[PDB]
Design a protein around this ligand. Structure first.
Ligand SMILES: CC[C@H]1OC(=O)[C@@](C)(F)C(=O)[C@H](C)[C@@H](O[C@@H]2O[C@H](C)C[C@H](N(C)C)[C@H]2O)[C@](C)(OC)C[C@@H](C)C(=O)[C@H](C)[C@H]2N(CCCCn3cc(-c4cccc(N)c4)nn3)C(=O)O[C@]12C
Ligand SMILES: [Mg+2]
Ligand SMILES: [Mg+2]
Ligand SMILES: [Mg+2]
Ligand SMILES: [Mg+2]
Ligand SMILES: [Mg+2]
Ligand SMILES: [Mg+2]
Ligand SMILES: [Mg+2]
Ligand SMILES: [Mg+2]
Ligand SMILES: [Mg+2]
Ligand SMILES: [Mg+2]
Ligand SMILES: [Mg+2]
Ligand SMILES: [Mg+2]
Ligand SMILES: [Mg+2]
Ligand SMILES: [Mg+2]
Ligand SMILES: [Mg+2]
Ligand SMILES: [Mg+2]
Ligand SMILES: [Mg+2]
Ligand SMILES: [Mg+2]
Ligand SMILES: [Mg+2]
Ligand SMILES: [Mg+2]
Ligand SMILES: [Mg+2]
Ligand SMILES: [Mg+2]
Ligand SMILES: [Zn+2]
Lengths: 215, 175, 122, 37
RNA sequence: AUAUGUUAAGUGGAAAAGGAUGUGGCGUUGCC
RNA sequence: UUGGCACCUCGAUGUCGGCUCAUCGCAUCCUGGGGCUGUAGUCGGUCCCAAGGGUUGGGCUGUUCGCCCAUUAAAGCGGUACGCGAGCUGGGUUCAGAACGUCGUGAGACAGUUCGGUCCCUAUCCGUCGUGGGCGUAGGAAAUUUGAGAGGAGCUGUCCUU
RNA sequence: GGGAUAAGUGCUGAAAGCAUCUAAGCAUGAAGCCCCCCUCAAGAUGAGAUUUCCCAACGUUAUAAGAUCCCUCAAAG
């Protein structure tokens, strides 16, 4: 029913009521604004569009993404908002309960809420079968010349080909990942911070999306 | 002999309104409606109705018998209705009315609730006797079947929910 | 972190001195046991005159590990050695005396007699 | 249920029927239930 | 396409001993 | 499977076992549903549906197989050149040395045994895993997206209560 | 969790006075099927949708929105 955008700051720990140790992820979710309401009538489905982080205003001869371009400035100005660095949609919210241009404060979530956190996992670059697919090494001694190779990739005359989906070296990480059934440990109104039990995908400063757990 | 060729003596209270191919039998005890076969003739007198088949194939005899049986069942259900009786055997086996639904205590960790449907009314007389009355014969049979299948009878002691008059095959248990 | 072929000192007076882990109980493919888990083991060394003889295949509960355990409050206990106690079917120790400190975790496993006999529970 | 290619009455109360294209025997004696297959 | 019929199994479009109120044509017959 | 046949390959289609990596069938080992029981219960026997997932770590032997130890819900049976050596090993097996038993007058040999004994190749095409450039998408662009379709996931124990 | 099913289990019900789960109808029923969960996905050439930005004269020359070259870099490689 709820959603908000934030940046992952880092990991720390808090002590629970019973003295239990709760590892937590600090998510900073300032400056969230509803930019657009998509509806079944116009777009074919219901969603709100949320911009997260304020950008600098447009200027001529801007060289980087720090400054809004004219299409982005117009789109944001339609919501009476500053242009935003990150923009994402939430289809799990009630379209009625939002006004275009309203803020989305962290206080929308309460302690004990069960949430799903979505983000882009850390990149690992080109990685082999051992690291990328958890495969086993060959022997490291006893004459072996097979240590980190992927092994056999097919059978023989039948099928005289490698099947689709064969696990092989390649770029690893940098994929969208949703971690389900995390919990809100604390919401701190100042500093606009949400404390999430456990760890969430991605590097520090990366964008995360928090939604009320679907399950 | 034959079943479909047999005539039906409609009740004086029941108004068998033959809506063409479709049929609708409003009577003292309720109303019924289902579309009879689209290849049969349902010509009726003022006080009687007699079904006739237009063909002679296997489908002709089969459809004629089933159509006449359905019509007679609708007439008898409008007139007198239908009663299904269930009996509970076993220590602690009881049933009760929670308003319209029926609760059964049949030895599970939980009771089982049997909800009432339209034109169906339940009734549990003693602790261990139940009854399913209604106009439609098929619906009454189906509800009684569900009530019985909550806990069907068992051979070693006859425990469970049995039909009134059901013969339960019994077996000595080699205790 | 006890696995197959791990050797543990015995912390009772059952007669076994050192045992070798044959199996970690608790499900298919389980590799490692820790404090409070039950293992199958063979007696490698035994004290003469004891009840449990060298070569016997017995069951033991781990009461001390070098890897130690982590507790719910973020605190840890680690020991300088790995030790176990030979138990009967009903979890009671086969011996009459327990030596060395044992971890509090044996309370959760209902090894209450072993807990009572130990000089120290930490 | 007896599932076998040879479906035939075992006792005098056995009845041979055809249900959904399968030759079956139904009887008061549950041991005599058969389905061809 | 035309005429008469058969099949309801997609049988047609891979198989046997054996089993079976599946259905059609033929008959010799019995009770009524 | 042991074979029968001798149709492809003798200007070479690398043989057993293991390792790595799988993939498919169902005649189902476990788990799910169900009928019969010479099914009281707890357990079983047998048959039917069911291939989603799961289906072990050691001792001996080159072994496959098998026996054993200890587990497990279970430790299923098969196909894929008895899957997989331009992926690995090389213990075994068709190599030169040597020895035993045995046979042979002998050189030597084996319903046998024993110790030792070089595993080459920089990937062109298809295939597969990743990752870019071009053009198209009836103006050009920035961002947010629907989802035709595709992939992934799918297991199960013990205890308490009733 | 929902929907449809397998083996089954039925209800109603004739053909065939009876009986019959089936022939017409009506239900119920599996870790299995289709969804529900996660990810990719319009080269889906059927190339989809929404919001916002921009607007020229005479093939050429210079441009708009927008980008790139080049340079400082890393959470990416
Ligand atoms: C390591 C290099 C050698 O490769 C191999 O030995 C192997 C591993 F590649 C090899 O044995 C291949 C696989 C062989 O082929 C197989 O032959 C079988 C009969 C049949 C099989 N298939 C068809 C079923 C074939 O694949 C064979 C005959 O080589 C002997 C190939 C032929 C063409 C052959 O003779 C070639 C020329 C062979 N050879 C004689 C080596 C002769 C042995 N040797 C000599 C040396 C050496 C010489 C000088 C210096 C140094 N430092 C070393 N090292 N090893 C070389 O001088 O070089 C190679 C390529
Ligand atoms: Mg390994
Ligand atoms: Mg190496
Ligand atoms: Mg027979
Ligand atoms: Mg066909
Ligand atoms: Mg066919
Ligand atoms: Mg052959
Ligand atoms: Mg010839
Ligand atoms: Mg050859
Ligand atoms: Mg050649
Ligand atoms: Mg099968
Ligand atoms: Mg399966
Ligand atoms: Mg298996
Ligand atoms: Mg092979
Ligand atoms: Mg080899
Ligand atoms: Mg090969
Ligand atoms: Mg060798
Ligand atoms: Mg001699
Ligand atoms: Mg050697
Ligand atoms: Mg789709
Ligand atoms: Mg396609
Ligand atoms: Mg479980
Ligand atoms: Mg488009
Ligand atoms: Zn019988």
């Amino acid at each position: 029913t709820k959603g908000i955008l934030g940046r992952k700051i880092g990991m720390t720990q808090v002590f629970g009521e019973n003295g239990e140790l709760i590892p937590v992820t600090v998510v900073e979710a300032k400056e969230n604004v509803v930019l657009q309401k998509k509806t079944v009538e116009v777009d074919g489905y219901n969603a709100i569009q949320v911009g997260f982080e304020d950008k600098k205003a447009y200027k001529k001869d801007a060289k980087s993404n720090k400054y809004a371009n004219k299409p982005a400035e117009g789109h944001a100005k339609k919501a009476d908002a500053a242009p935003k660095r990150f923009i994402r949609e939430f289809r799990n919210v009630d379209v009625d309960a939002y006004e275009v241009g309203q803020e989305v404060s962290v206080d929308t979530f309460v302690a004990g809420d069960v949430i799903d956190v979505t983000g882009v996992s850390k990149g690992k670059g080109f990685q082999g079968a051992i690291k990328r697919h958890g495969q086993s090494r060959g022997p490291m001694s006893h004459g072996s010349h097979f240590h980190r190779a992927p092994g056999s990739v097919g059978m023989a005359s039948d099928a005289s080909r490698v099947f689709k989906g064969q696990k092989m070296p390649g770029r690893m990480g940098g994929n969208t990942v949703t971690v389900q059934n995390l919990e809100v440990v604390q919401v701190d109104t100042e500093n606009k911070v949400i404390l999430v039990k456990g760890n969430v995908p991605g590097p520090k400063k990366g964008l995360v999306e928090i939604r009320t757990s679907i399950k | 002999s034959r079943v479909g060729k047999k005539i039906i003596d409609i009740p004086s209270d029941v108004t068998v309104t033959f809506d063409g191919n479709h049929v609708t039998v409003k009577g003292p005890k309720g109303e019924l409606s289902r579309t009879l076969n689209e290849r049969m003739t349902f010509k009726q007198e003022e006080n009687t109705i007699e079904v006739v088949r237009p063909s002679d194939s296997k489908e002709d005899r089969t459809n004629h018998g089933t159509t006449r049986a359905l019509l007679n069942n609708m007439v008898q259900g409008v007139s007198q209705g239908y009663v299904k009786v269930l009996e509970l055997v076993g220590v602690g086996y009881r049933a009760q009315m929670q308003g319209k639904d029926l609760i059964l205590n049949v030895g599970y960790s939980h009771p089982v609730e049997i909800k009432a449907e339209e034109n169906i009314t339940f009734s549990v007389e003693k602790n261990t006797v139940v009854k399913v009355e209604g106009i439609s014969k098929e619906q009454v049979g189906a509800l009684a079947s569900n009530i019985r299948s909550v806990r069907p009878p068992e051979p070693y002691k006859g425990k469970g929910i049995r039909y009134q008059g059901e013969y339960v095959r019994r077996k000595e248990g080699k205790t | 972190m006890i696995q197959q072929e791990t050797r543990l000192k015995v912390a009772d007076n059952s007669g076994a001195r050192e045992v070798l882990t044959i199996k970690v109980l608790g499900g298919s493919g389980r590799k490692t046991a820790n404090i409070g888990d039950v293992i199958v083991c063979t007696v490698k060394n035994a004290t003469p005159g004891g009840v449990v003889k060298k070569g016997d295949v017995v069951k033991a509960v781990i009461v001390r590990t070098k890897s130690g355990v982590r507790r719910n409050d973020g605190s840890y206990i680690k020991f300088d050695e790995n030790a176990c106690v030979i138990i009967r079917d009903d979890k009671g120790p086969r011996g009459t005396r327990i030596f060395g400190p044992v971890a509090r975790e044996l309370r959760e496993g209902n090894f209450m007699k072993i807990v009572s006999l130990a000089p120290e529970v930490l | 249920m007896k599932v076998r290619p040879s479906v035939k009455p075992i006792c005098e109360k056995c009845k041979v029927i055809k249900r959904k294209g399968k030759v079956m025997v139904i009887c008061e004696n549950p041991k005599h239930k058969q389905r061809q297959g």
